[PDB]
Amino acid sequence: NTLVKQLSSNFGAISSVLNDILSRLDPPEAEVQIDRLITGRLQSLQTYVTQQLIRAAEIRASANLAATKMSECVLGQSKRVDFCGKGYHLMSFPQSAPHGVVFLHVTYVPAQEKNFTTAPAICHDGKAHFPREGVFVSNGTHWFVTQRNFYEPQIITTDNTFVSGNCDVVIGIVNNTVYDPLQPELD
Amino acid sequence: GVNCTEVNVFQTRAGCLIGAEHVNNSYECDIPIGAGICASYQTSQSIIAYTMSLGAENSVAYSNNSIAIPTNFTISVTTEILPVSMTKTSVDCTMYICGDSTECSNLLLQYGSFCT
Amino acid sequence: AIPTNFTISVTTEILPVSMTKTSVDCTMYICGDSTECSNLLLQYGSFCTQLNRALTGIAVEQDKNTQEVFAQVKQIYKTPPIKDFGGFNFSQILPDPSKPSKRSFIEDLLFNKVTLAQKFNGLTVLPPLLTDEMIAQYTSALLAGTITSGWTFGAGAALQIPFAMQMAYRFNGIGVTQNVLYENQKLIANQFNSAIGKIQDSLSSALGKLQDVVNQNAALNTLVKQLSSNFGAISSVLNDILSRLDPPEAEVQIDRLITGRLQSLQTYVTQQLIRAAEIRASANLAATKMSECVLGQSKRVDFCGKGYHLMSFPQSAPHGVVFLHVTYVPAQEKNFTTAPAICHDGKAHFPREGVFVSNGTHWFVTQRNFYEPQIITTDNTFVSGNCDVVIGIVNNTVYDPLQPELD
Ligand SMILES: *[C@@H]1O[C@H](CO[C@@H]2O[C@@H](C)[C@@H](O)[C@@H](O)[C@@H]2O)[C@@H](O[C@@H]2O[C@H](CO)[C@@H](O)[C@H](O)[C@H]2NC(C)=O)[C@H](O)[C@H]1NC(C)=O
Ligand SMILES: *[C@@H]1O[C@H](CO)[C@@H](O[C@@H]2O[C@H](CO)[C@@H](O)[C@H](O)[C@H]2NC(C)=O)[C@H](O)[C@H]1NC(C)=O
Ligand SMILES: *[C@@H]1O[C@H](CO)[C@@H](O[C@@H]2O[C@H](CO)[C@@H](O)[C@H](O)[C@H]2NC(C)=O)[C@H](O)[C@H]1NC(C)=O
Ligand SMILES: *[C@@H]1O[C@H](CO)[C@@H](O[C@@H]2O[C@H](CO)[C@@H](O)[C@H](O)[C@H]2NC(C)=O)[C@H](O)[C@H]1NC(C)=O
Ligand SMILES: *[C@@H]1O[C@H](CO)[C@@H](O[C@@H]2O[C@H](CO)[C@@H](O)[C@H](O)[C@H]2NC(C)=O)[C@H](O)[C@H]1NC(C)=O
Ligand SMILES: *[C@@H]1O[C@H](CO)[C@@H](O[C@@H]2O[C@H](CO)[C@@H](O)[C@H](O)[C@H]2NC(C)=O)[C@H](O)[C@H]1NC(C)=O
Ligand SMILES: *[C@@H]1O[C@H](CO)[C@@H](O)[C@H](O)[C@H]1NC(C)=O
Ligand SMILES: *[C@@H]1O[C@H](CO)[C@@H](O)[C@H](O)[C@H]1NC(C)=O
Ligand SMILES: *[C@@H]1O[C@H](CO)[C@@H](O)[C@H](O)[C@H]1NC(C)=O
Ligand SMILES: *[C@@H]1O[C@H](CO)[C@@H](O)[C@H](O)[C@H]1NC(C)=O
Ligand SMILES: *[C@@H]1O[C@H](CO)[C@@H](O)[C@H](O)[C@H]1NC(C)=O
Ligand SMILES: *[C@@H]1O[C@H](CO)[C@@H](O)[C@H](O)[C@H]1NC(C)=O
């Protein structure tokens, strides 16, 4: 719209339209006004072209980002935090749009919590067991082992822990028992 | 860029605001006036100019032997919108600069190679 | 070759985020208090609205950049009065209430470094939206959340956890087991404190990244000095050219001045769009780095620091952001003699998640990023086929700890 509206300014000539210039006046005395008009219109074209180039560069950067998001969120599962949505990522679906793309991001997200008391090791008989891929939680009397993203408690045994060292160097430790289920079945 | 000595005058850090009551509360930003202040219409009604609030404020009972475990999950669906392309418009330089004339074209030919 | 010791190492990284806003009048700069100039300028059409529109767009984009970079949280957390973090000393990064503002020792030690007439020609500067105290509060809230929750606050609610167990999770995320941390916690705490002290010393005696922005935005001097040029006229003062001539002969002089000053404004505005685009790209990179290094644990090699990644802490330099990556590098190595498979009775025994090293005579299985030899039991490996296809294999025996109990 601005590029069009630039076509009605004198820029210094006696009129803003070329046909009037060439009809009312003799060309050897009209070349100067024609030069003025040509200079003005060239300036307008240069301005428009430069700004369009900058806009195109920005749009290209955005399109590259959109292509990367399509390649990683949709055709696979991502772990880049807060890339494909907000929270843990399950999958995404693409949807077209006029001159754009719209993504739908199904995302796992945790809810209602429950306080607990923890400890990093268990001195059974001088040794010190450690959880394999869990965390030691106690409701207040008995100690359990659960995964770190969902409360599911199981009885602590010797198939959830692996010994390492002795229970005199770990800063926090608590005495407890370990089931060792082989012994009852041995009888 | 003036002081309120010159021409409901709540002197800001960003200038001289005229026509807005100054309240003591803290809400979210509707009109980003600048330098912290943000004006809004929700106060029978009059425009107010309050100070920003960064959000809520809470703490966690962090302790050396306390942990919190989630017990129930939920599933959410969000959206994000990204432009990809725009219109492909070309402009003929001669038809715009000149018209249907010929002397205009002959004079434009002196400027070398701009249209190309 | 396997390491036998490790050393924590803290390094920084400086990124610019935004640049000074600027709105430039395109009528006071050209004409001034005159009116003949204001009438002559009207012929050029809409050449005094597009420049203003572009400059306001740039300013809005700067506000957008800062908001995207720093506003990653909704709740504003607070460090507890309890200061029991298992050995680490976070008393050079957390805010100090004694100072007038809430900038910590590193933050104001950094603000001391960078040093941040023109107006009467029509050149005006605008104030930022988020005042510096708000930025400091954002950084402090991010620090408190990271310290007291690790990453869970970046994906929903905030879940409390002891810091030592959080570092255990961090080590377990890069391959090394957790007993490795739980055995020598004091050494790691001391190394962390020493690294933080060394960084504090280093920053107290560079910041070229944040200084190039200022030395390029202060353009303004060239724009100002493009006023004492005749541009082909007889004198570069409108109040003089209209006090020594008459309209028919003053119009050409005024027109030449108009053309020159319009070219100068066009060049300035053109440069301050390319600079803005570069700054926006840098701000986007900084936002990504915040969201991935700070609110999680990165796996991309050499993204957050150099080495393996544990955690990071943000800061706030003037017109930028500063990270402190906490890396992990192994130190002391030893030669060994490995072998992919150990077949006992015609049954190859590949290791589960370790490696089959030997100290010359015996054979022990150990993990990769550290050294802790063990015995080749049955639960430590798994059988696969018979040993006649594996290229390099040495013949040995396993322990099978089920035997002693059944006697
Ligand atoms: C979880 O955190 C604290 C502590 O609760 C205890 O945590 C263990 C030590 C164990 O003994 C648990 O069985 C206990 O439940 C509490 O936080 C309180 O939250 C209320 C919310 O209204 C607040 O008014 C109190 O000031 C908080 N107390 C402290 C000391 O900060 C509460 O039990 C749990 N908090 C939440 C938010 O669920
Ligand atoms: C904490 O957990 C322990 C271990 O489960 C609970 O003790 C038993 O729990 C089972 C169900 O899990 C009940 O059927 C038993 O009656 C419980 N035994 C006793 C002696 O109480 C215990 O109840 C839980 N709660 C507390 C407060 O300790
Ligand atoms: C967690 O910290 C508390 C202190 O906040 C420990 O409780 C004891 O607190 C008294 C306070 O005077 C100290 O003198 C004791 O030294 C603390 N006990 C110990 C063992 O240091 C509590 O024991 C701590 N828990 C763990 C697992 O370290
Ligand atoms: C987890 O949350 C869901 C949804 O809030 C719970 O499902 C509801 O449970 C209540 C009570 O049993 C029912 O009346 C509703 O019909 C259930 N569905 C919905 C959509 O509300 C579910 O019980 C929760 N699980 C746990 C373990 O708390
Ligand atoms: C691993 O390296 C650390 C240093 O990064 C060693 O820690 C030093 O240990 C000696 C005595 O063993 C002390 O005198 C020093 O004060 C410790 N710190 C430093 C910075 O030197 C540690 O001993 C090394 N571990 C092994 C097994 O060699
Ligand atoms: C490789 O490590 C084993 C570890 O068991 C070494 O075995 C020791 O050998 C000495 C030789 O007299 C015995 O006294 C020890 O009882 C053995 N066990 C331990 C734990 O020391 C073996 O010597 C090492 N090989 C080499 C070449 O150093
Ligand atoms: C565990 O038992 C030992 C003795 O068997 C005792 O010295 C210690 O105080 C107990 N409690 C711990 C280690 O927390
Ligand atoms: C602006 O006006 C206020 C109120 O009179 C005065 O306190 C302040 O000093 C003034 N500032 C300047 C720069 O004149
Ligand atoms: C509002 O704040 C001002 C400045 O602190 C104070 O003078 C005034 O009493 C406050 N009014 C109310 C109603 O809190
Ligand atoms: C942390 O370091 C400062 C400065 O050396 C010291 O004053 C303070 O006591 C230290 N805090 C702890 C817990 O070591
Ligand atoms: C391993 O042996 C090579 C060859 O002699 C030697 O250069 C290298 O230093 C040895 N590695 C160690 C850790 O001693
Ligand atoms: C492979 O194991 C057999 C046992 O059946 C043994 O005789 C042979 O020496 C072993 N191979 C080598 C190279 O020692």
Residue numbers in the entry:
A (entry chain A): 960 to 1146
B (entry chain A): 614 to 620, 641 to 676, 689 to 761
C (entry chain B): 713 to 828, 852 to 940, 944 to 956, 958 to 1146
Paper text:
The spike glycoproteins of coronaviruses are responsible for receptor binding and membrane fusion during the initial stages of virus infection. The spike proteins of most current severe acute respiratory syndrome coronavirus 2 isolates contain a D614G substitution, by comparison with the spike protein of initial isolates. Viruses that have spike proteins containing the amino acid substitution D614G are currently predominant in the severe acute respiratory syndrome coronavirus 2 (SARS-CoV-2) pandemic, and it has recently been shown that G614 viruses have higher infectivity and produce higher viral loads than D614 viruses. In this study we present high-resolution, single-particle cryo-electron microscopy structures of the G614 spike variant showing that it adopts a predominantly open conformation, unlike the D614 spike that is mostly closed.
